[PDB]
């Protein structure tokens, strides 16, 4: 599925991540823009021979299994194609874990570089939340 902006702006609030750990909706919605052009079905291969999964590219070292990444943990407890679904529970589930690990969204790569420092609050102008 490709979620709309503000269709994914809602779906995230609705999941209880307004503000999660101090991280504002247009933190989240900024994330998914960057890591997956808000879309669920998105892949893509590290270079440590890891992949990242779906709306917010989640990746199986640590987080979700996917039977073929040497060596990596499943702290999510869930298989990486999970994270795939149309429906986002899986992935913000897990998505919690990680922001809560120590780093913040500093674990997003594309968060760090692309949305902090940044006007977030714009990615959620227009929308009825
Ligand atoms: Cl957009
Ligand atoms: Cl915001
Ligand atoms: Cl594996
Ligand atoms: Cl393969
Ligand atoms: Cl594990
Ligand atoms: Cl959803
Ligand atoms: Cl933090
Ligand atoms: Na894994």
Known sequence: KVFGRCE???????????????????????????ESNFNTQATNRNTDGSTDYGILQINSRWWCNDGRTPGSRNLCNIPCSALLSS???????????????????????????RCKGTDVQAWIRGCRL
Do not use: E, P, Q
Request: net charge positive; glycine share 10%; aromatic share 12%.
């Open 8 to 34: 994914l702006a809602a779906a995230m609030k609705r999941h209880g991540l307004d503000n999660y750990r101090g991280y504002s909706l247009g933190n989240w919605v900024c994330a998914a823009k960057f």
């Open 87 to 113: 429906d986002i529970t899986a992935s913000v589930n897990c998505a919690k874990k990680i922001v809560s690990d120590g780093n913040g969204m500093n674990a997003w790569v594309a968060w760090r570089n």
